[PDB]
């Protein structure tokens, strides 16, 4: 008789990707090796991020990484992002880049490579930098999905600016009693 | 009446009142709720200054005795078991005690 609780002794985390993609499953075979035989904690983060679901590795825009690479103590390092690099049409000039991502959209290749940049894949990243030396590990906006605007405290609550689920928006869809001070009350 | 006794911190000061951020336990959760109370129902709690006094000597005894090169205790240690000592029983002999008999007092 031991007085403990087995409620949360099984840690909930991914230990291998649910995806059956063999090219993804080959990368994990490569980085499982690099994570445990190098003391570099960079590879442990990349290993953990390869397991994650698509909703946990959101796309990195092209202008976001430009915004993060124009920071001072940089511009020689390499851009490493486990998600995918989409092209941002609302930026005009493109500096030359050294990018490593899982997947690059067709327009974002042509716009990067036209600027004399360089696109890398994760097998070529390990060849050029095994321990992750001189790289900047980035991530797209994780809570930028439309879904999180419904989360939080429920709507119809004091100071709970949360988007409700409505089948269509209009003047006669959730503009009455809970919302107008003239109709009953409001929050 | 649920705050009579509860202690909090001030976050807003008006003419005759203050706003307090106090904790209120409500059925298995604590809420840091803001209440507006007049000055008359308010005292400066002294549950803090004796630590503020302890900060003075801790800043005093850290600057002082540093030039002496010594290391003096700062943390409060709990009341230890008392050390070995003697007890002088000079001349007199310890008086003998005896349980008294029963006297029905009523």
């Amino acid at each position: 008789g031991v007085d403990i609780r087995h409620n949360k002794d099984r840690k909930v985390r991914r230990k291998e990707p649910k995806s059956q993609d063999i090219y993804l499953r080959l990368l994990v075979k490569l980085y499982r090796f690099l994570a445990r035989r190098t003391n570099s904690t960079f590879n442990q983060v990349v290993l953990k991020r390869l397991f994650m679901s698509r909703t946990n590795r959101p796309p990195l825009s092209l202008s976001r990484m430009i915004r993060k690479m124009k920071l001072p103590g940089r511009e020689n390092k390499t851009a490493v992002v486990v998600g995918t690099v989409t092209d941002d049409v609302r930026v005009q000039e493109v500096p030359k880049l050294k990018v490593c991502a899982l997947r690059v959209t067709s327009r974002a290749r042509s716009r990067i490579l036209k600027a004399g940049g360089k696109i890398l894949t994760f097998d070529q990243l390990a060849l050029d930098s095994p321990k992750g030396r001189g790289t900047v590990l980035l991530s797209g906006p994780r809570k930028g999905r439309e879904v999180y605007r419904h989360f939080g405290k429920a709507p119809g609550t004091p100071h709970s600016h949360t988007k409700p689920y409505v089948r269509s928006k209009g003047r006669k869809f959730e503009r009455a009693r809970g919302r107008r001070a003239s109709r009953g009350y409001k929050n | 009446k649920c705050y009579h006794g509860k202690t909090g911190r001030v976050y807003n000061v008006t003419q005759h009142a203050v706003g307090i951020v106090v904790n209120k336990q409500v059925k298995g959760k604590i809420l840091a709720k803001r209440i507006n109370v007049r000055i008359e129902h308010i005292k400066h709690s002294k549950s803090r200054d004796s630590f503020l006094k302890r900060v003075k000597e801790n800043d005093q005894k850290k600057k002082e005795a540093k030039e002496k090169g010594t290391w003096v205790q700062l943390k409060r240690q709990p009341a230890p078991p008392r050390e070995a000592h003697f007890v002088r029983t000079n001349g007199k002999e310890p008086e003998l005690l005896e349980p008294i008999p029963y006297e029905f007092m009523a």
């Binding site: - | 976050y11 807003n12 706003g19 904790n23 336990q25 059925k27 298995g28 959760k29 604590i30 809420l31």
Partner: protein, 104 residues
Amino acid sequence: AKSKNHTTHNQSRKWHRNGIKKPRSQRYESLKGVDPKFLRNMRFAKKHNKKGLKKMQANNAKAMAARAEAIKALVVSRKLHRLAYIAHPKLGRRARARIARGLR
């Protein structure tokens, strides 16, 4: 067909399962409900904080060098203590070379 009316029996036990979490403390708590006339001034003091930009960079810098002159005007027994020195890797190498000749 009466029934029970109210009871707080299993409740205290139910609350401490997931713990009674204290409210999450965080520096810079929100400035909500603070009286407007004081807050309205506080936004003006933050609006005009660029006005003293040249003074501040030219106040701490002359205070940065003034700190660089107050420094520039200044800048259980020996037996077990001995055996504790032979037993050290990084600074006992020269010591135990005397024993290596003891076999010789």
